[PDB]
């Protein structure tokens, strides 16, 4: 029925409505609820390991490849303009103000934005997440608070590591394989950086959709209905949305500052 | 009725997100801390070929501001440029001249000013009287060696 | 719970200790001794090092039971304990859930779809249906309540108040027209 | 199988028809009539439109059974049929798996950890263990085989050939030293 | 009133099909164009650097855009055609448009010098006289001998 | 033990070794095994819907955002060079030869590279994938062959749609919000395209790691061990690898052709 | 059912249309700029910066594009073969084809002069005379050495 | 255990170092670039090509960076203030400071011409004499078109 | 399947370590550790564009990099220090070395004329005679203004 079809559409409207409402409530309860008995900092260490460190080889190799691609594209894009040696101010400006954090999102939100949702989803599905209450610990502070903290304090560091490896790979292909001159590269690069105005720009950009990624990437895991199909669908909702939001907030955050 | 509460908070957050349009939020040419008070001035040139808007009007090298707009006054068919001056710069006599320069060799044709000397200084919203138009690679070559041989 | 509900993060020992490390401040030796005596009581004393990921799905429940009986709670709940395991594991579990009650004198609330073993061990069984307790009694009175709903439940008798067939239209028309 | 193993893609009707639409070329009406008579035999005749996603986990198995008995196979296998459902659904299922054998005279191979109902309905039960059949017999001979392994299995008797405790070191030293 | 809230879907539809028409308002009938201001022709002997739809200016201020360029094989010449805003119509007919080059490498562009002949531009008259675009090769081949 | 630690490392070596070996065998059996009884083309239609169409809104919105970001970055990157109007030959060359297909991978491999693995994983886990054999149909031709075909014939179309929407959004922000001139944009764009040499380059680039994405994104789903934790880990392995391979083969495919 | 087929078909057509819009419009392919052009040859002493698909023009306005370049194995000159739009069909025979560079760094295109009033061409013929491509070296070393 | 603490600390530190290497060995703010250095002023008649973060040099090699260009509201000249490395503290006061364009089209740095005196510096004072920077409109309005 | 497993693990670790080494030889750039070649110095009056790692060359072909540039506190001049590929070992002391600039916008680089014919070098000594780099300003100054 078309009228009831639109009824279902509107029900989905109110559904995402109440969804992110409940999400912000969840986030509040998690970051500022109380202090639980069985918490600490070792939790944060274990998480930060599972979320950042394990997801580090991926972004290292990905930074390598995307950097040398950025080079092999800039060299050939610009040799048609003579200003070949200026490739440094490209491979280090695009890889540092916009593409750096965007790809770092789409990868972090790819792996650690998912195997983080499936983790606390599975937890909810084997009731493990529930027996915590019957014990007495608040899960939203023992199970998910270290997730959020491993998010906020990993993805920015990951973006930095990615940008570094990207620039270095771009140089290594440009210097050794393209043949452009050694010192000229870093020279034009440092002459065209504007630290507080591009580097810090990219870092605040990284942090904001670090927060946004590992916010949904954990909420979805907390909300998914407990069944092996439910989790299998939540760990896809949290890639759809974690990429949508990465790019959307990249766009807004770059309209705030060109 | 937790559903109602969730809906309310979600509407608050969607409002907060819509509060970030960034299509003329803080209309200005600079930040909100900087007053942006820059008084007007006009100037009458005969060719401003590379004095596009967003240039840099300067004096002795240091920037004094930027061009705001360029116009063709339909009476004399000359160029009239309207530009701005930082208020701290308020000490330019009227007999001073303005002329288009070129940053290095292929830098955008900015305009510099040469201070003349006259006790009265500025309405700062007035125009200039005398100038030297931008050099062009055509009439120069034409009068030096295209037609003067 | 059924499926144990162990914390995949922590090994068996820390897993069992968790409630102690929460509600009580004991010398980290003494916690170890309570954990050890409990694990012995349940039998999973040997695997005090395994991670539950490494643990065979059967004992993965007995360790959970030990975690429960930690702190010596006076009552305890069972979410479908004897559901889906070889009758040896089911036997040891039904022996433990009864040993805990006969010895420790702690109230235990089994919650099982399995009628046979429940009615075997239970003392005052209930029946919950569509938001209303559908009566209750000791196994005996319940075996002959003659309440159609209940007597249909506690016995096989597939056709009764709960229908067998789905609400179809007609076995004649639909197949013919 | 247990958990039905229905195709989430196709609705109930197409799901049950599938084996026919595979091994036989029948007028699309005639397939509908065979599907209908089977669904009636199993009782899920009404929900000939539901998608299995919409179907309550109980009948989600009886429809699978109907799909099986489609084509009228002469033997059929049951992967843990009566495991984890309210004794009404278990009752109707144990009535059907026996009705199919008493009527249709088709060999059926139940495979269930549940000893009680298996030994209730079965005729020649086996016991498979660690790659070797651990004997076999009709329920009677099996109830008193006195083979320690088996007699431990077919009864509760938790402690026997299969150990109760894990291979710990010492209940004295470890807790003391 | 949960059925009485179907309207949300309505909103969303009215919110979606709206955006579509706004994505399709690329023309933007909120007029900011110039309404196809008036065409002018001119004949040059060489327009080498003049690309289609460059810029036409006078006194440095952009007058408009060159609409197109062509060649008349009878005269073997380059007939260029450009629009000019109507607010500036006081151009005299004798006023000559000549190709200039911005700076030293800035792209070629036609600039007009007023003629002050008191006959305002008839709005359609081809340019009577001009100075063609210079050519490096022309310069060097004129003075090497 | 360190020696046994290296033993485990080497075992993982042989493991990924035999893994992708078995993967290529699987792929062969799937695309060229036989012709099954219960197959057809309606299967391909249903799949192609579930894989392409549902994953189309994501890449549409993502193309929009990434295009307007590419613009808002090019305008400001290049106004410092005067050649502002040349933004068209940027926002339409980077979004069409390298970044177009790369982001289309990281998104398709994000959503349809995962909710495609979880799908045929869940199938294997509820034994649904196995009763097909007891019926007689070969699953590798009824269940996964339409997956592969919905992969190969969707991701390239998706890359094209993405590049189109990206260019159009870049124009819409450049024209209407940046103010750069209408015709000049498309003019410099078409003067600097080299169809058979950039457009077709981007399309073959899209196709190759379409094949590569929806190859692992279905193999992993076929191999994952049947348990709600197994699938939850496979649908992360198939994002790690599906992004690794996207970028790696982008790099190789752009070294084949600058 | 049917809505599936309709959706998937509509959006397959959408994909293919997008591929073409990338092909036809943005990439500026044949159909938009296809036409009837004929060939001609030209012998130059030097073509230093004549690139394939470089422009050939007259009176400034573009005419066609160079097709191909070759070195003649006899006199070791540059035989350049280039296209001309058919509507341009009045270039006489004594017209001169020289190499021109608009901006000092602009690419080295070719421009042809007006050849008096003789017969036009065969448009498939060659040209006779030329002004070859200057270089910086010859420019300076010419005005040196003594 | 602790094999996880060591790893996570390692890579926290790796990210931190990477942030620094971006900030310092890729943007070059202050690790010895504009730290222990001492000021000086100079009066130029035109600083057209002189920009902040430029370079003050002597005999080609860099001596430091420039800090702030300003207009003295009385004479309207440019007051250019710049830092000088402390190891370099041997300049005479009569020495000039001209503006040189890098190569032929590069940015405009400024270079010092040792004049030769006994009094060396105050490193925070100004300079007496110098040569301004050229500009095309001048040179061509200079002795090229006055006939 | 117990020996070759550990062997494969060791093979993999060795390969990763080798990739590591090859990667690190990019920094501390791939022309040896110290060359492993010979140093030399030179004094100039202006080295404006001879920043670290600039080409030292003879007869056009580069010989090595520059290593360091400094302002000697005594003579107020520039001192530049550079390595030399060891196969290049026949440079007489009486050579000169001026700061060439390739083309016009090229990054300045030092080119060395053999100069005279005498003792080759100590390869760690200094040079004596040379020509500093030119500056546009002096040129359009001394030779135009006065
Ligand atoms: C009058 C107020 C009362 C209610 C108003 C709520 C409407 C606002 C929320 C819109 C979301 C509707 C989508 C539902 C469709 C659906 O099927 O749902 C689509 C999905 C969920 O689909 P499923 O549940 O079927 O999987 O939801 C989403 O996509 C959520 C992302 C939407 C964006 C959230 C933030 C909005 C950003 C700002 C808007 C940009 C517009 C630009 C204008 C300048
Ligand atoms: C994924 C692919 C990467 C993109 C590469 C494709 C081709 C490059 C872009 C085309 C623009 C160049 C044509 C103009 C010719 C010219 O004169 O360009 C060369 C000119 C010459 O002046 P200089 O010698 O001073 O450098 O310099 C510049 O234009 C400066 C810009 C260089 C690039 C710096 C990085 C900013 C670019 C945007 C960053 C984020 C965008 C990337 C993702 C959206
Ligand atoms: C050209 C104009 C562009 C238009 C701009 C509009 C889009 C803006 C960006 C889109 C955001 C993506 C929406 C994803 C949410 C969703 O899909 O909503 C759907 C999901 C849940 O929906 P379901 O459970 O029903 O599937 O939302 C969530 O998971 C809950 C949290 C949502 C995350 C919101 C992020 C807000 C960003 C705040 C940044 C400020 C913080 C900085 C502090 C330091
Ligand atoms: C101003 C009010 C508008 C608020 C935002 C409207 C949200 C509407 C979302 C519906 C979109 C299609 C959903 C179809 C459902 C489906 O099949 O697919 C639904 C998909 C996922 O499919 P599933 O149902 O299988 O989960 O969900 C989505 O990802 C939808 C993403 C919506 C994102 C909206 C972001 C706003 C766009 C910003 C553009 C900025 C331009 C402005 C320039 C001036
Ligand atoms: C025109 C050219 C034609 C090109 C042909 C395409 C060939 C594609 C083959 C790719 C293989 C895909 C793997 C399939 C998925 C799978 O099953 O593979 C899955 C298995 C993992 O199995 P398990 O994890 O389940 O054990 O292996 C993988 O994870 C593969 C990882 C893919 C990484 C790709 C990296 C390539 C780039 C390397 C370049 C190195 C650069 C160094 C220079 C300095
Ligand atoms: C001629 C030289 C070309 C050599 C080609 C090889 C390059 C391709 C290597 C594939 C990348 C592996 C990452 C896969 C993700 C993963 O492992 O997934 C991450 C896993 C996850 O671990 P868990 O088992 O605990 O989940 O971590 C690992 O165990 C792997 C550790 C090491 C793997 C290699 C990563 C660093 C080495 C990269 C080499 C780059 C060389 C640099 C060039 C100069």
DSSP per-residue codes, D26-91 = --HHHHHHHHHHHHHHHSTTTTSS--GGGS-TTHHHHHHHHHHHTT--SEEEEES-SSSS-HHHHH
Q: Residue I83's closest CA among I47, I46, I55, I113?
A: I55
Q: What's the alpha-carbon Rg for chain F, to the nearest Å?
A: 22
- Asked whether residue C166 is assigned to any structural domain, the reply reads no
CA dihedral C89, C95, C98, C101 (to 10 degrees): -100
B111-114 and B131-132 as β-strands: parallel, antiparallel, unpaired?
Answer: unpaired
Residue A161 CA to residue A170 CA, distance in Å, equals 14
DSSP state, C5?
Answer: -
After which residue numbers is chain F interrupted with C–N beyond 2.5 angstroms?
none
Q: Residue A161's closest CA among H21, I23, I17?
A: H21
CA-proximal residue: ligand 1, atom 25 (nearest) = A12
Q: What angle, 0 to 180 degrees and rounded to 10, lies between the N-to-C axes of helices F155-173 and F145-152?
A: 30
Can you list the alpha helix ranges (DSSP code H) found in chain H?
Answer: 3-23, 136-141
**Residue F219: both structure tokens together:** 């193999």
The answer to whether the Cβ–Cβ distance between D84 and C85 falls below 8 Å is no
Mutate to test the pocket of ligand 1, among A11, A14, A16, A248 (most ligand atoms within 8 A of CB): A16
The strand pairing partners of G66, in sequence order, are G82
H22 close to A164: Cβ distance less than 8 angstroms:
yes
CA dihedral E57, E62, E65, E70 (to 10 degrees): 10
Q: Is the dihedral of CA D33, D35, D37, D39 positive or negative?
A: negative
Nearest to H18 among A92, A161, A194 (CB): A161
- Asked whether residue C159 is assigned to any structural domain, the reply reads no
Nearest ligand, CA E23: 4
- Asked whether residue C20 is assigned to any structural domain, the reply reads yes
Q: Residue F100's closest CA among F68, F67, F73?
A: F67
I65 close to I13: Cβ distance less than 8 angstroms:
no
C-alpha of residue A90 to centroid of ligand 2, in Å: 6
- How many alpha carbons fall within 13 Å on the CB side of residue A151? 30
Chains H and F share 3 or more Cβ pairs within 8 Å: no
- Asked whether residue D92 is assigned to any structural domain, the reply reads yes
DSSP state, E92?
Answer: B
The strand pairing partners of E69, in sequence order, are E80
DSSP per-residue codes, chain I = --HHHHHHHHHHHHHHHHHHHHHHTTSS-SS-SSTTSEEEEEEES--TT--SS-EEEETTEEEEEEEEEEE-TTT--EEEEEEE-TT-----TT-EEEEE-STTTSPPEEEEE--S-S----SSS------PPP-HHHHHHHTTT-
* φ/ψ of residue C175, rounded to 5: -75, -25
Buried b (16+ CB within 10 A) or exposed e, I8-24: bbeebeeeeeeeeeeee
G108-112 and G55-58 as β-strands: parallel, antiparallel, unpaired?
Answer: parallel
Contacts 24+ apart (CB under 8 A), H1-10: H4/A45, H4/A46, H4/A49, H5/A45, H7/A49, H7/A53, H8/A45, H8/A48, H8/A49, H8/A52, H8/A53
Nearest ligand 2 atom to alpha carbon F70: 44
C-alpha of residue F223 to centroid of ligand 5, in Å: 16
Q: What's the alpha-carbon Rg for chain A, to the nearest Å?
A: 22
**Residue H50: both structure tokens together:** 């002189």
- Asked whether residue D40 is assigned to any structural domain, the reply reads yes
- Asked whether residue D168 is assigned to any structural domain, the reply reads no
Q: Is B119 exposed, middle or buried (0-12, 13-18, 19+ CB in 10 A)?
A: exposed
Q: Is the dihedral of CA A3, A4, A8, A11 positive or negative?
A: positive
Residues of B with CB under 8 A from a CB of F: 23, 54, 108
Q: What CATH number corresponds to the domain at position C133?
A: 3.40.50.300
Residue A150 CA to residue A147 CA, distance in Å, equals 5
C75-79 and E61-64 as β-strands: parallel, antiparallel, unpaired?
Answer: unpaired
Residue A108 CA to residue A245 CA, distance in Å, equals 13
**Residue C101: both structure tokens together:** 């009650």
Q: Residue F78's closest CA among B68, A81, H53?
A: A81
Q: Residue F121's closest CA among F242, F43, F240, F233?
A: F233
- Asked whether residue D170 is assigned to any structural domain, the reply reads no
I94 close to I87: Cβ distance less than 8 angstroms:
no
CA-proximal residue: ligand 6, atom 27 (nearest) = A54
Asked if A179 has any chain I CB less than 8 Å from its own CB, the reply is no
C-alpha of residue F18 to centroid of ligand 5, in Å: 13
Q: What's the alpha-carbon Rg for chain B, to the nearest Å?
A: 23
Q: Is the dihedral of CA I139, I140, I141, I146 positive or negative?
A: positive
Chains E and D share 3 or more Cβ pairs within 8 Å: no
Ligand 1 binding pocket, CB closer than 6 Å = A 12-13, 15-17; B 14, 17; E 8, 11-12
C-alpha of residue A8 to centroid of ligand 3, in Å: 22
Subunits adjacent to chain B (3 or more Cβ pairs under 8 Å): A, E, F, H
Q: How many domains does chain C divide into? A: 1
Note the residue count of chain H.
147
- Asked whether residue D14 is assigned to any structural domain, the reply reads yes
Nearest CA to CA, how far is F2 from chain I (Å)? 11
Residue G85 CA to residue G123 CA, distance in Å, equals 10
F201 close to F97: Cβ distance less than 8 angstroms:
yes
Q: How many CB atoms lie within 10 A of CB G1?
A: 7
Q: What angle, 0 to 180 degrees and rounded to 10, lies between the N-to-C axes of helices H3-23 and A155-173?
A: 60
Buried b (16+ CB within 10 A) or exposed e, F62-93: bbbbbbbbbbbbbbbbeeeebebebbbbbbbb
Asked if A193 has any chain H CB less than 8 Å from its own CB, the reply is yes
Angle, alpha carbons F26-F32-F36 (nearest 5°): 95
After which residue numbers is chain G interrupted with C–N beyond 2.5 angstroms?
none
Query: Chain-centre distance of CA A50, in angstroms?
Result: 15
**Is residue A14 classed as helix, strand or coil in its secondary structure?**
helix
**Residue B134: both structure tokens together:** 């931008």
Angle, alpha carbons A63-A64-A67 (nearest 5°): 75
Q: Which domain holds residue C92?
A: 1-154
Nearest ligand, CA F245: 5
A134 close to A35: Cβ distance less than 8 angstroms:
no
Query: Chain-centre distance of CA D52, in angstroms?
Result: 19
Q: How many CB atoms lie within 10 A of CB B90?
A: 12
Nearest to I45 among H57, H59, H62 (CB): H59
C15 close to C38: Cβ distance less than 8 angstroms:
no
* Torsion region of E60: left, alpha or beta (phi above 0 gives left; psi -120 to 50 gives alpha): left
Q: Residue F181's closest CA among E62, D145, G13?
A: E62
* Chain E partners within 8 Å of B47 (Cβ): 59-60, 111
- Determination method here? cryo-EM
Nearest ligand, CA A241: 3
**Residue H120: both structure tokens together:** 């060396």
**Is residue G58 classed as helix, strand or coil in its secondary structure?**
strand
C-alpha of residue I66 to centroid of ligand 2, in Å: 30
Nearest to I105 among H57, H105, H134 (CB): H105
Contacts of F27 by beta carbon, 8 Å cutoff, 6+ apart: F148, F215, F219
Residue I49 CA to residue A208 CA, distance in Å, equals 41
The tokens 């699953």 sit on which residue? F139
Q: Residue F159's closest CA among A143, H25, G18?
A: G18
Residue D115 CA to residue E29 CA, distance in Å, equals 80
**Residue F226: both structure tokens together:** 């049947």
Residue I45 CA to residue H59 CA, distance in Å, equals 5
DSSP per-residue codes, C88-125 = HHHHHHHHHHHHHHHTT--EEEEE-S-HHHHHHH-SSE
- Structural element, H or E, at residue F47: helix F42-48
């Amino acid at each position: 029925s078309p009228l009831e079809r639109i009824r279902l559409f509107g029900r989905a409207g109110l559904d995402v409505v109440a969804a992110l409402g409940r999400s912000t409530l969840f986030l509040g309860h998690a970051l500022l609820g109380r202090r639980t008995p069985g918490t600490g900092l070792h939790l944060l260490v274990k998480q930060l390991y599972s979320v950042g460190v394990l997801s580090l080889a991926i972004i290292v190799v990905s930074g390598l490849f995307i950097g040398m691609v950025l080079a092999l594209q800039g060299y050939n894009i610009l040799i048609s303009y003579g200003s070949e040696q200026a490739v440094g101010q490209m491979v280090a400006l695009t890889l540092l103000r916009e593409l750096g954090p965007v790809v770092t999102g789409l990868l972090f939100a790819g792996r650690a934005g998912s195997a983080l949702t499936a983790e606390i989803g599975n937890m909810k599905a084997t009731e493990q997440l529930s027996s915590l209450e019957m014990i007495g610990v608040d899960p939203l502070k023992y199970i998910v608070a270290p997730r959020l903290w491993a998010g906020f304090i990993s993805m920015p560091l990951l973006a930095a590591i990615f940008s570094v490896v990207g620039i270095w790979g771009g140089a290594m292909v440009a210097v050794d394989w393209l043949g452009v001159y050694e010192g000229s590269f870093w020279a034009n690069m440092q002459n065209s950086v504007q630290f507080t105005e591009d580097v810090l720009n990219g870092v605040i950009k990284s942090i904001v959709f670090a927060f946004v990624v590992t916010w949904i990437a954990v909420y979805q895991g907390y909300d998914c209905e407990p069944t092996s199909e439910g989790i299998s669908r939540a760990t896809t909702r949290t890639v759809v949305y974690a990429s949508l939001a990465v790019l959307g907030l990249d766009f807004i955050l770059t309209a705030l500052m060109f | 009725q937790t559903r109602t509460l969730e809906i309310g908070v979600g509407l608050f957050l969607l409002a907060g997100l819509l509060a970030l349009l960034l299509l003329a939020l803080r209309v200005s040419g600079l930040s909100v801390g900087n007053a942006g008070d820059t008084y007007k001035v006009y100037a009458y040139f005969d060719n401003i070929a590379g004095v596009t808007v967003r240039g840099k009007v300067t004096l002795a090298g240091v920037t004094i501001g930027k061009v705001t707009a360029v116009d063709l006054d339909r009476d004399s068919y000359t160029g009239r440029v309207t530009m701005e001056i930082n208020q701290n710069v308020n000490n330019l006599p009227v007999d001073s001249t303005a002329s288009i320069l070129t940053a290095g060799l292929l830098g955008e044709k900015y305009i510099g000013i040469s201070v003349g000397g006259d006790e009265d200084v500025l309405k700062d919203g007035s125009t200039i009287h005398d100038t030297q138009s931008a050099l062009v690679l055509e009439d120069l070559i034409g009068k030096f060696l295209l037609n003067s041989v | 719970f059924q499926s144990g509900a162990l914390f995949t993060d922590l090994d068996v020992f820390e897993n069992v200790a968790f409630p102690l490390r929460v509600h009580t401040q004991l010398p980290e030796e003494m916690i170890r001794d309570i954990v050890l005596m409990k694990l012995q009581a349940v039998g999973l004393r040997g695997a005090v090092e395994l991670m539950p990921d490494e643990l065979s799905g059967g004992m993965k429940r007995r360790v959970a039971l030990a975690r429960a009986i930690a702190l010596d709670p006076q009552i305890l709940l069972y979410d479908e304990p004897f559901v889906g395991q070889d009758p040896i594991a089911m036997g040891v579990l039904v022996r433990l859930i009864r040993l805990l009650n006969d010895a420790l004198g702690i109230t235990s609330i089994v919650v099982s779809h399995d009628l046979a073993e429940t009615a075997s061990i239970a003392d005052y069984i209930y029946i919950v249906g569509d938001g209303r307790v559908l009566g209750h009694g000791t196994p005996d009175v319940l075996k002959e309540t003659d309440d159609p709903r209940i007597r249909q439940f506690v016995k096989g008798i597939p056709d009764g108040p709960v229908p067998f067939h789905y609400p179809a239209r007609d076995y004649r028309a639909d197949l013919l027209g």
